[PDB]
Enzyme design. Structure first.
Site, PDB file in Angstrom:
ATOM      1  N   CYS A   1       0.837  -1.190   0.000  1.00 13.86           N
ATOM      2  CA  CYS A   1       0.000   0.000   0.000  1.00 13.86           C
ATOM      3  C   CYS A   1       0.879   1.249   0.000  1.00 13.86           C
ATOM      4  O   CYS A   1       1.670   1.444   0.932  1.00 13.86           O
ATOM      5  CB  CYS A   1      -0.874   0.015   1.260  1.00 13.86           C
ATOM      6  SG  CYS A   1      -1.911   1.490   1.353  1.00 13.86           S
TER       7      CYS A   1
ATOM      8  N   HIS B   1      -4.352  -8.119  -4.124  1.00 14.20           N
ATOM      9  CA  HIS B   1      -5.083  -8.656  -5.239  1.00 14.20           C
ATOM     10  C   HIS B   1      -4.274  -8.438  -6.521  1.00 14.20           C
ATOM     11  O   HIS B   1      -3.258  -7.675  -6.558  1.00 14.20           O
ATOM     12  CB  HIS B   1      -6.457  -7.979  -5.336  1.00 14.20           C
ATOM     13  CG  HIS B   1      -6.376  -6.486  -5.470  1.00 14.20           C
ATOM     14  ND1 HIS B   1      -6.025  -5.868  -6.655  1.00 14.20           N
ATOM     15  CD2 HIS B   1      -6.524  -5.497  -4.558  1.00 14.20           C
ATOM     16  CE1 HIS B   1      -6.026  -4.555  -6.479  1.00 14.20           C
ATOM     17  NE2 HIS B   1      -6.317  -4.303  -5.215  1.00 14.20           N
ATOM     18  N   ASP B   2      -4.735  -9.171  -7.541  1.00 15.05           N
ATOM     19  CA  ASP B   2      -4.155  -9.113  -8.867  1.00 15.05           C
ATOM     20  C   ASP B   2      -4.496  -7.786  -9.553  1.00 15.05           C
ATOM     21  O   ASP B   2      -5.307  -6.963  -9.057  1.00 15.05           O
ATOM     22  CB  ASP B   2      -4.607 -10.331  -9.682  1.00 15.05           C
ATOM     23  CG  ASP B   2      -4.137 -11.653  -9.065  1.00 15.05           C
ATOM     24  OD1 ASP B   2      -3.114 -11.678  -8.329  1.00 15.05           O
ATOM     25  OD2 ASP B   2      -4.807 -12.679  -9.326  1.00 15.05           O
TER      26      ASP B   2
ATOM     27  N   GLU C   1      -9.878   1.350  -4.012  1.00 13.86           N
ATOM     28  CA  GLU C   1      -8.570   1.996  -4.148  1.00 13.86           C
ATOM     29  C   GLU C   1      -8.566   3.062  -5.244  1.00 13.86           C
ATOM     30  O   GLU C   1      -7.908   4.104  -5.104  1.00 13.86           O
ATOM     31  CB  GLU C   1      -7.501   0.917  -4.336  1.00 13.86           C
ATOM     32  CG  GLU C   1      -7.279   0.155  -3.008  1.00 13.86           C
ATOM     33  CD  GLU C   1      -6.836  -1.280  -3.193  1.00 13.86           C
ATOM     34  OE1 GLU C   1      -6.496  -1.698  -4.322  1.00 13.86           O
ATOM     35  OE2 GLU C   1      -6.798  -1.985  -2.175  1.00 13.86           O
TER      36      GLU C   1
HETATM   37  C1  HEM Z   1      -5.835   0.699   7.370  1.00 16.26           C
HETATM   38  C2  HEM Z   1      -5.885   1.238   6.147  1.00 16.26           C
HETATM   39  C3  HEM Z   1      -5.372   0.571   4.852  1.00 16.26           C
HETATM   40  C4  HEM Z   1      -4.996  -0.700   4.637  1.00 16.26           C
HETATM   41  C5  HEM Z   1      -4.926  -1.856   5.667  1.00 16.26           C
HETATM   42  C6  HEM Z   1      -4.625  -0.832   3.254  1.00 16.26           C
HETATM   43  C7  HEM Z   1      -4.163  -1.994   2.640  1.00 16.26           C
HETATM   44  C8  HEM Z   1      -3.826  -2.094   1.306  1.00 16.26           C
HETATM   45  C9  HEM Z   1      -3.429  -3.316   0.616  1.00 16.26           C
HETATM   46  C10 HEM Z   1      -3.337  -4.696   1.296  1.00 16.26           C
HETATM   47  C11 HEM Z   1      -3.220  -3.019  -0.684  1.00 16.26           C
HETATM   48  C12 HEM Z   1      -2.743  -3.965  -1.848  1.00 16.26           C
HETATM   49  C13 HEM Z   1      -3.861  -4.187  -2.890  1.00 16.26           C
HETATM   50  C14 HEM Z   1      -3.248  -4.518  -4.252  1.00 16.26           C
HETATM   51  O1  HEM Z   1      -3.004  -3.487  -4.943  1.00 16.26           O
HETATM   52  O2  HEM Z   1      -2.964  -5.727  -4.650  1.00 16.26           O
HETATM   53  C15 HEM Z   1      -3.432  -1.589  -0.828  1.00 16.26           C
HETATM   54  C16 HEM Z   1      -3.311  -0.922  -2.035  1.00 16.26           C
HETATM   55  C17 HEM Z   1      -3.579   0.397  -2.231  1.00 16.26           C
HETATM   56  N1  HEM Z   1      -3.871   1.332  -1.217  1.00 16.26           N
HETATM   57 FE1  HEM Z   1      -4.122   0.954   0.796  1.00 16.26          FE
HETATM   58  N2  HEM Z   1      -4.766   0.401   2.659  1.00 16.26           N
HETATM   59  C18 HEM Z   1      -5.252   1.288   3.593  1.00 16.26           C
HETATM   60  C19 HEM Z   1      -5.559   2.612   3.396  1.00 16.26           C
HETATM   61  C20 HEM Z   1      -5.397   3.339   2.238  1.00 16.26           C
HETATM   62  C21 HEM Z   1      -5.790   4.733   2.041  1.00 16.26           C
HETATM   63  C22 HEM Z   1      -6.507   5.611   3.093  1.00 16.26           C
HETATM   64  C23 HEM Z   1      -5.409   5.070   0.780  1.00 16.26           C
HETATM   65  C24 HEM Z   1      -5.625   6.430   0.046  1.00 16.26           C
HETATM   66  C25 HEM Z   1      -6.405   7.416   0.477  1.00 16.26           C
HETATM   67  C26 HEM Z   1      -4.835   3.894   0.170  1.00 16.26           C
HETATM   68  C27 HEM Z   1      -4.372   3.769  -1.115  1.00 16.26           C
HETATM   69  C28 HEM Z   1      -4.106   2.588  -1.774  1.00 16.26           C
HETATM   70  C29 HEM Z   1      -3.994   2.484  -3.231  1.00 16.26           C
HETATM   71  C30 HEM Z   1      -4.219   3.604  -4.258  1.00 16.26           C
HETATM   72  C31 HEM Z   1      -3.676   1.035  -3.522  1.00 16.26           C
HETATM   73  C32 HEM Z   1      -3.454   0.393  -4.910  1.00 16.26           C
HETATM   74  C33 HEM Z   1      -1.939   0.268  -5.174  1.00 16.26           C
HETATM   75  C34 HEM Z   1      -1.793  -0.294  -6.571  1.00 16.26           C
HETATM   76  O3  HEM Z   1      -2.826  -0.752  -7.118  1.00 16.26           O
HETATM   77  O4  HEM Z   1      -0.656  -0.286  -7.140  1.00 16.26           O
HETATM   78  N3  HEM Z   1      -4.803   2.878   1.079  1.00 16.26           N
HETATM   79  N4  HEM Z   1      -3.846  -1.026   0.397  1.00 16.26           N
HETATM   80 MN   LIG Z   2      -1.718  -6.577  -5.966  1.00 13.12          MN
END
Ligand code: HEM
Ligand SMILES: [Mn+2]
Ligand SMILES: *[C@@H]1O[C@H](CO)[C@@H](O[C@@H]2O[C@H](CO)[C@@H](O)[C@H](O)[C@H]2NC(C)=O)[C@H](O)[C@H]1NC(C)=O
Ligand SMILES: *[C@H]1O[C@H](CO)[C@@H](O)[C@H](O)[C@@H]1O[C@H]1O[C@H](CO)[C@@H](O)[C@H](O)[C@@H]1O
Ligand SMILES: *[C@@H]1O[C@H](CO)[C@@H](O)[C@H](O)[C@H]1NC(C)=O
Ligand SMILES: *[C@@H]1O[C@H](CO)[C@@H](O)[C@H](O)[C@H]1NC(C)=O
Ligand SMILES: *[C@H]1O[C@H](CO)[C@@H](O)[C@H](O)[C@@H]1O
Ligand SMILES: *[C@H]1O[C@H](CO)[C@@H](O)[C@H](O)[C@@H]1O
Ligand SMILES: *[C@H]1O[C@H](CO)[C@@H](O)[C@H](O)[C@@H]1O
Ligand SMILES: *[C@H]1O[C@H](CO)[C@@H](O)[C@H](O)[C@@H]1O
Ligand SMILES: *[C@H]1O[C@H](CO)[C@@H](O)[C@H](O)[C@@H]1O
Ligand SMILES: *[C@H]1O[C@H](CO)[C@@H](O)[C@H](O)[C@@H]1O
Ligand SMILES: *[C@H]1O[C@H](CO)[C@@H](O)[C@H](O)[C@@H]1O
Ligand SMILES: *[C@H]1O[C@H](CO)[C@@H](O)[C@H](O)[C@@H]1O
Ligand SMILES: *[C@H]1O[C@H](CO)[C@@H](O)[C@H](O)[C@@H]1O
Ligand SMILES: *[C@H]1O[C@H](CO)[C@@H](O)[C@H](O)[C@@H]1O
Ligand SMILES: *[C@H]1O[C@H](CO)[C@@H](O)[C@H](O)[C@@H]1O
Ligand SMILES: *[C@H]1O[C@H](CO)[C@@H](O)[C@H](O)[C@@H]1O
EC number: 1.11.1.10
Length: 299
Positions: free
Chosen positions: A30, A106-107, A184
């Protein structure tokens, strides 16, 4: 940034500097959690992280309200239990376990490779956790030549990523994940849409340079005029953006899309894993940090 720098003022009045992760530090898949840990808003070592620590960090340093991460917190802890084999209470063991595949991770990610992307053998796996510049460029390329993009553009990006992943992953591995990815998507609009435009709340446009800075550097694009959204973004904005992306008309359809790719997505819901299911092995790679260039404390 350094607290005395005032770079976050008056949106964030209590900043901490960027510090690159060391080889023993834990980082996530993330870009948001990674930026927070790089600044010590959550532990710099990426270990033993409470719900309130995460809530305060997102609210005070990223302008993301508690409502936005409620489900994310639930899922983080479900995954922690699944991976480690016991209840994690209110201390997330580390960030790295969040890259457990076919779970919360995820993928067809925007900026990470898939767990079995391009592997010659069925048992192989690769780094599906660290920022991957090539993968990210495949997302950026969809909006090449532009400074901003809208819901329809985002829909085209996720479709390109689904296409590439379905073609490149070891046969049988690829699993579509529209509900998680498009939360996301909503997150991207929530953090880096251009609030300096008069109709941001109703028609948000992502600033590509802000997006690129956040993802590549795992730090905050203050130098480009970004600041935490004020008031903090709430869950309604996110799920609306999510639905709007998936509702957007597709004008360029990639080949090799999984079935049902185009159209609305299910509402994201708590994950759950059968108690007999052993987790996939986590990628063990050292945490990524920006090197071209390396970042200073105020970047
Ligand atoms: C406790 C809060 C959070 C947790 C546990 C979490 C967890 C994760 C995880 C496990 C992924 C990987 C998913 C994947 O792309 O295969 C991820 C991706 C991502 N997260 Fe977080 N997230 C949190 C909060 C946030 C917040 C608040 C934002 C933005 C405001 C954010 C932005 C993103 C984005 C944009 C991705 C996609 C990365 C990509 O596709 O390359 N996340 N998150
Ligand atoms: Mn992934
Ligand atoms: C984050 O925590 C996970 C979960 O404990 C670690 O992954 C396990 O590491 C132990 C060795 O310490 C192995 O025996 C297990 O096989 C691992 N689990 C899985 C599913 O791979 C991981 O090493 C930790 N990462 C960091 C950087 O601290
Ligand atoms: C992570 O470490 C495992 C055990 O040490 C290896 O078996 C894995 O292949 C994986 O190695 C990759 O990441 C580490 C970072 O700790 C490097 O040392 C390896 O060279 C490799 O890139
Ligand atoms: C930052 O400090 C200024 C000056 O006291 C104050 O007006 C502003 O509300 C503060 N910002 C936040 C988010 O607390
Ligand atoms: C990463 O941060 C540095 C330092 O502020 C900046 O010069 C660089 O352009 C950033 N990278 C991207 C892709 O925005
Ligand atoms: C996004 O979607 C959720 C339900 O998934 C709504 O509660 C919210 O108001 C927004 O429309
Ligand atoms: C839900 O909210 C989003 C963001 O404000 C809008 O873009 C969408 O049209 C709907 O009103
Ligand atoms: C979810 O919400 C979006 C944004 O308003 C709509 O465009 C979509 O039809 C769905 O109801
Ligand atoms: C949605 O609308 C677009 C134009 O915005 C068409 O190109 C597409 O076929 C779909 O009907
Ligand atoms: C049709 O129009 C959409 C609207 O944004 C684009 O995303 C797509 O690339 C195609 O030109
Ligand atoms: C329209 O855009 C999609 C997504 O970028 C491509 O897959 C297709 O080749 C066409 O250029
Ligand atoms: C590409 O093709 C899909 C379905 O084949 C359409 O939904 C889309 O509008 C685009 O023309
Ligand atoms: C391919 O498979 C999916 C099942 O998830 C359907 O949504 C689609 O209609 C097609 O049959
Ligand atoms: C983002 O949120 C919307 C509304 O809940 C879903 O329809 C979509 O699949 C994604 O989870
Ligand atoms: C969530 O749902 C799953 C279904 O696979 C159960 O196995 C799990 O124990 C929890 O109830
Ligand atoms: C977890 O471990 C079990 C047995 O050790 C495997 O059979 C399973 O597929 C998973 O890797
Ligand atoms: C990253 O490390 C390099 C060392 O060459 C510096 O040039 C840069 O300022 C940053 O600290």
């Amino acid at each position: 940034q350094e607290p005395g720098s005032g770079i976050g003022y008056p949106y964030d009045n209590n900043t901490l500097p960027y510090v690159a992760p060391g080889p023993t530090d834990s980082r996530a898949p993330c870009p948001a959690l990674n930026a927070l840990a790089n600044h010590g808003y959550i532990p710099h070592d990426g270990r033993a992280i409470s719900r309130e620590t995460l809530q305060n960090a997102f609210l005070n340093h990223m302008g993301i309200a508690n409502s936005v991460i409620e489900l994310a917190l639930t899922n983080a802890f479900v995954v922690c239990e699944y991976v480690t084999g016991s209840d994690c209470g209110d201390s997330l063991v580390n960030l790295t376990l969040l890259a457990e595949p076919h779970a919360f991770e995820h993928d067809h990610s925007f900026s990470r490779k898939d767990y079995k992307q391009g592997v010659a053998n069925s048992n192989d796996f690769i780094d599906n956790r660290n920022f991957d510049a090539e993968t990210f460029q495949t997302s950026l390329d969809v909006v090449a030549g532009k400074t901003h993009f809208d819901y329809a553009d985002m829909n085209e990006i996720r479709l390109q990523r689904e296409s590439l992943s379905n073609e490149l992953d070891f046969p049988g591995w690829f699993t579509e994940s529209k509900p998680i990815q498009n939360v996301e998507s909503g997150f991207i609009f929530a953090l880096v849409s251009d609030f300096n435009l008069p109709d941001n709340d109703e028609n948000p446009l992502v600033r590509i340079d802000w997006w690129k800075y956040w993802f590549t550097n795992e730090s905050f694009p203050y130098h480009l005029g970004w600041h935490p959204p004020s008031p903090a973004r709430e869950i309604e904005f996110v799920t609306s953006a999510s639905s709007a992306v998936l509702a957007a008309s597709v004008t360029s359809t990639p080949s090799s899309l999984p079935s049902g790719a185009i159209g609305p997505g299910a509402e994201a819901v708590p994950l759950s894993f059968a108690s007999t299911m052993t987790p996939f092995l986590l990628a063990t790679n050292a945490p990524y940090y920006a090197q071209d260039p390396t970042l200073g404390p105020n970047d």
